[PDB]
Each structure stands twice: as C-alpha cells, then as structure tokens.
C-alpha cells in the first residue's frame, strides 16, 4: 500500500523517519492507530498515522 505524506514530519526518536509533504511512502505496518511503519526510500521507521493518507 502507498500513503501520501500530508505534512512534513521530522524524526524525533530512533524508531522514526523523516518525510516531506508530498512524499509517497510504502506502508509496511498500520496495525497501531497512532504510528505507522513506512519506508521512505531505503529507510524504514514510524511516522504519525494522522499525517498520511492511504491511496
């Protein structure tokens, strides 16, 4: 599944990754309601689920 980044997010912990608004990310795990695991080109980690939209 692909998600679209609606906002910029800068990583704030070791498990997070950074994304820019408009990035299309690969969604790896959306089992948590708040934090989803994504791949943003050869990095994998968590971003806030509210800040992305599934395509």
From Swiss-Prot:
SH3 domain ranges (all copies): 1-55
Signal peptide bounds: none
Localization, UniProt: Cytoplasm, Cytoskeleton; Cytoplasm, Cell cortex
Family to which the UniProt record says this protein belongs: Belongs to the spectrin family.
Subunit structure, interactors included: Like erythrocyte spectrin, the spectrin-like proteins are capable of forming dimers which can further associate to tetramers. Interacts with ACP1.
Protein task: Morphologically, spectrin-like proteins appear to be related to spectrin, showing a flexible rod-like structure. They can bind actin but seem to differ in their calmodulin-binding activity. In nonerythroid tissues, spectrins, in association with some other proteins, may play an important role in membrane organization.
Full protein name: Spectrin alpha chain, non-erythrocytic 1
Source organism of this protein record: Gallus gallus
Biological classification of the source: Eukaryota, Metazoa, Chordata, Craniata, Vertebrata
Gene that this polypeptide is encoded by: SPTAN1
Residue span relative to the full protein: 970 to 1024 of 2477
